[PDB]
Amino acid sequence: RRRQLIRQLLERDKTPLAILFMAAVVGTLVGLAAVAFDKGVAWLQNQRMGALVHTADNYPLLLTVAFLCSAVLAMFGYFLVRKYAPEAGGSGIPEIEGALEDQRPVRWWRVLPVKFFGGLGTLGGGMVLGADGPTVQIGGNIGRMVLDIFRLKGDEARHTLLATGAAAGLAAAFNAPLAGILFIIEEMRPQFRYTLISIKAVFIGVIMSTIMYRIFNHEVALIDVGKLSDAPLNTLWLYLILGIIFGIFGPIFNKWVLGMQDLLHRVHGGNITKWVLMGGAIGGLCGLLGFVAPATSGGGANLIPIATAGNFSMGMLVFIFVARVITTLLCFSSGAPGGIFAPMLALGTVLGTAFGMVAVELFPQYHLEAGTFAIAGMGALLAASIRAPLTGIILVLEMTDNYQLILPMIITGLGATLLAQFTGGKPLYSAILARTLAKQEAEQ
Amino acid sequence: RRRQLIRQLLERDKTPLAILFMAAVVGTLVGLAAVAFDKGVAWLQNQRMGALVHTADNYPLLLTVAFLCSAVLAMFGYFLVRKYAPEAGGSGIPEIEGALEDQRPVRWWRVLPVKFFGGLGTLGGGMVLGADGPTVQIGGNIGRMVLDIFRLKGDEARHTLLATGAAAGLAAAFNAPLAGILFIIEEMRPQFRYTLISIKAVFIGVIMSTIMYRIFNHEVALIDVGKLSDAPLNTLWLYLILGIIFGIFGPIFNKWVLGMQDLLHRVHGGNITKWVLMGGAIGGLCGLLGFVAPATSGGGANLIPIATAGNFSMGMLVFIFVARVITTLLCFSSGAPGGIFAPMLALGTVLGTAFGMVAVELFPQYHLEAGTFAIAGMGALLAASIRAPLTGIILVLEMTDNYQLILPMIITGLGATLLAQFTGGKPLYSAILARTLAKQEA
């Protein structure tokens, strides 16, 4: 096949101008989409706060209007999903991944409204859910929609505009362009065969997405954490140990989301009214915990600079980790619309901080800042649970600009994915696709 | 396919422990190797410096001892490549690329000593070439060497260990662990068919490689440029224009490297003595340039911060850019062992800084710093000529740490890789692998 390859080599990277232009408009719309979705989630959480002040005297009334305001919004999003778009429950990444294997449909006429307005429901109630799931599936479908509109043919185009959509989608959720592109290249593309996902075109989509985000967001970065200390060579072995800790917990967490998916399906069996009611209970519990124990609820982007700085006690870190594991499972395993990615950064940090804390007290000769161990462990549930270590390392890198920590971030990351592999664990997004293709068959 | 897929998903990212443990040995070896390559080169540039001290009075004599010292060292490397391993000429990234498509041999028992010691000659005489060619080829060969020694069977084991070695080698040359992983993913894996390269094992080898770099180098990074200003959004269109300029020049420079590869071959006809004699005059010229005007010679990493801080006049920059476009084509089209990746970084930094200075005077309302256009231009030739923009960006990112410039950098990058596609350029590493398979069926 020598002569064949000489031909292909000379034809490499010649994406059709049609796809390059269209990836631009996908990026842009996904950008405006995520920006709108981001503004809307905020506005709801705010109206929720100003309610607790029209009533801030009667504390039992206070705990009540906190619960019902989230419950109602939870339910509204659960309902929007079962009634009109069931594959828009949960993250949506496993679907958009299925769409790339050509095994799941991109029902964009249903999912765009269902995910967007249904996500605003669950996120806006203050449930423990990220915006990544929403934006990524929303972005994916937006790619499909502009395909079907301009009726472009080829595999290249269907897969590209699907990729650049969900890529631009993740980018716009975190202001993380590099992280989006890598997410397609490492995690989303079809993993057992070749593909015609133009990477140059995913690049154009991500650009536009990210520019649109800079137009409605500037002067504030999602997280500021400032410059932390370096790490000496003789400290690296501590980050490897922290990777191993993630590597055994990573898979353990994966078992729980699945068994909790099962456990919560026993609660409604499929019944849209038991389900929506159950979601409202979950919602209201989060909005209640949102008032009374805020670090145990919400997406988690907030307490990440607090937890780097070392402002929490060790007892608090232990509390938050247990409590947030529990609400993370309740919210994500329930099937409410919304990703798990962003709350796994939170669980990661908290754990890394707690470790840096013990590490600082054991080794004063090392001159540690517990904040470095938190940054290494932020991308570490991503490594050990969804097994996209290159994505999380660069995602964290983009969010925290502490490049002098690249070696320990990497080292904790592979430690995580190595022990996650070796203790018998599977990628989370992949093992959700499969259970969903194995119900898309066991019914026959 | 649904039954097939479901079964494959439940089995994903289960790289055999044998491969992973062997990836760790590959990275360790390449880091040590690459460190050693780096220390050697400097030691020889040092000797050439202190030898100009013992002859620092006779200005004609001085010019001659610099010419000869490098001329001699040049020839030693041209010889070591023609006599014992021809596929160790030039970069060797095309070579490792062919090897991953199963279309070229990894003659490691021949190439390791040739590329290592031949590289020491051309680099150490201060020729316009980068340790990256040498280190990526050495790394891949080191990855084949442990595959053989330990008799690991399989297409996966052969493709992975060959890859993590070449990533380990780019990392070690630039202290760029991500930029190494991304090189394999974006440019060096088989580009048109699926492959069983294990990313988790490339990562492991790059860690070990880079850890070696930090044990013998730390508290010093290759380039330090400071923290530059941010990029207002009403400034970004200026960065699309730069990538367009880089996007048209990229292919023209690609022609010139392909074309002059041809023209220097007519000089020696293929003959090892005219060739080694030609290389000594190139490498002799370089070590001479390196005294009467050091910015027209060398790998070029030197003048990237000197350019970014606008410490050059507009004239000097125009010079340095044309002079270095010359001495880059002479050194690399000549067959001399050594990468083009670093001398391209220095070309784009020079181009960008010049562009920055024009902007600063046309638009005082934008409060510009020319240094931010250097950092977007640094990796723009990489984007426009070898057409690995992701790897390029993330490389310069890991080398300059001005992450606030990620958007202008990403934009000049696509600005180049788009206009390079639309003016009919090619991935120069794939264009060389092509012209080398075209002679292998004729």
Epitope: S229, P232, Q365, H367 | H218
Partner: antibody, heavy 121, light 107 residues
Framework: EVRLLESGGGLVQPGGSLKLSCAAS????????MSWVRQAPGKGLKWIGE????????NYTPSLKDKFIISRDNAKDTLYLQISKVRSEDTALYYC??????????????WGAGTTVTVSS | DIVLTQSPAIMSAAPGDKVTMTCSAS?????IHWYQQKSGTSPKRWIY???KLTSGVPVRFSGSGSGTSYSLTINTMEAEDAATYYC?????????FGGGTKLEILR
């Protein structure tokens, strides 16, 4: 240049107190741990204590409770050492150093000229 | 805590001549540092991490060792080499110096 200029040591009466000041000039005085070391006359170097840049951790040698109080004032670019309940054992030349590391086994990077504390009645 | 004892407490040696002091620790120690003090001058960092010279330290100086025994060595001694050499560890906390070694010109 990198200059560490410590002042403030003179004569104190036994059981009194003093506040040595080390003024820093020529480097970003944050990002650096600062440390105090004293030398008793005709004796060797003894480590007093150290302070990390955000003052979130101050380590002192095995010695008493409010004996030493290291603070720093990162804005004035100055390091401080209060000694209370001063004995003759505290009669020593007091050194102020900036801390760094290589492989990460921490060392005393740049020292100052010193000041002398005499404790006599 | 770790006790460092530098061995030839005082010593002389002619110039153009080899000199060798010793640091010896009660427990094991990793990567020792060495300072050079002249009277009335700040201690100068001389040698860190068992072996590494500092920016300016002439090449005649060198260090070696492992575990519980290190050393400092001047291959050819100059006149400017008379000073006190303090070894210092921080492999363990808290850190500790040696007694010193006073190097005087012999004449």
């Amino acid at each position: 240049e990198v200059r560490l200029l410590e002042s403030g040591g003179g004569l104190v009466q036994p059981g009194g107190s003093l506040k040595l000041s080390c003024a820093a000039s020529g480097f970003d005085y944050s990002r650096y741990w600062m440390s105090w070391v004293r030398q008793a006359p005709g004796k060797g170097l003894k480590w007093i204590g150290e302070i990390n840049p955000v003052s979130s951790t101050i380590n002192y040698t095995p010695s008493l409770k409010d004996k030493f109080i290291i603070s720093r004032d990162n804005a004035k670019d100055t390091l401080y050492l209060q000694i209370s309940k001063v004995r003759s054992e505290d009669t020593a030349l007091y050194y102020c150093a900036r801390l760094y590391y290589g492989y990460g086994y921490w060392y005393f990077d740049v020292w100052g000229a010193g000041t002398t504390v005499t404790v006599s009645s | 805590d770790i006790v460092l004892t530098q061995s030839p407490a005082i010593m002389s040696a002619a110039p153009g001549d080899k000199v060798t002091m010793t640091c010896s620790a009660s427990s094991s120690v990793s990567y020792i540092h060495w300072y050079q003090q002249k009277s009335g001058t700040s201690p100068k960092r001389w040698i860190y991490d068992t072996s590494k010279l500092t920016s300016g330290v002439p090449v005649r100086f060198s260090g070696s060792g492992s575990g519980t025994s290190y050393s400092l060595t001047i291959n050819t001694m100059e006149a400017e080499d008379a000073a006190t050499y303090y070894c210092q560890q921080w492999s363990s906390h808290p850190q500790t110096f040696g007694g010193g070694t006073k190097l005087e010109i012999l004449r």
